[PDB]
From Swiss-Prot, chain A:
Name recorded for this polypeptide: Spike protein S2'
Effect on the protein upon substituting residue 42 to F: In strain: Omicron/BA.1
Region (Heptad repeat 1): 1-31
Originating species: Severe acute respiratory syndrome coronavirus 2 (2019-nCoV)
Entry coiled-coil feature ranges: 10-49
Function: Subunit of the fusion protein that is processed upon entry into the host cell. Mediates fusion of the virion and cellular membranes by functioning as a class I viral fusion protein. Contains a viral fusion peptide that is unmasked after S2 cleavage. This cleavage can occur at the cell membrane by host TMPRSS2 or during endocytosis by host CSTL. In either case, this triggers an extensive and irreversible conformational change that leads to fusion of the viral envelope with the cellular cytoplasmic membrane, releasing viral genomic RNA into the host cell cytoplasm.
């Protein structure tokens, strides 16, 4: 009946999931680039730049 | 490597350049090492009749 009695394991799983999710989400960041997609910045631009 | 070029295309002679002579006539390597020297030869390489 009583839930929330298993906080440790649930916390561990949530921590792993959050770390993975934010690692995946980091792909969309720009980091000061012009875009977060390689193909478009490759196509719109030229070689030496 | 020596030749003559139209005046405006002078900056096409560089690694990773795109143009007419840069890709149809003479392409430089991207990791080229060395120097490029450009100067005008109007008084000899030009003709009033062309």
């Amino acid at each position: 009946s009583t839930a929330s009695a298993l906080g440790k394991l649930q916390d561990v799983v949530n921590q792993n999931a959050q770390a993975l999710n934010t690692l995946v989400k980091q792909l969309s960041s720009n980091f000061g680039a012009i875009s977060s997609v390689l193909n478009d910045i490759l196509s719109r631009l030229d070689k030496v730049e | 490597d020596s030749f003559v070029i139209r005046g405006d295309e002078v900056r096409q002679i560089a690694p990773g350049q795109t143009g007419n002579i840069a890709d149809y006539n003479y392409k430089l390597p991207d990791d080229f090492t060395g120097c490029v020297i450009a100067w005008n030869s109007n008084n000899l390489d030009s003709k009033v009749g062309g």
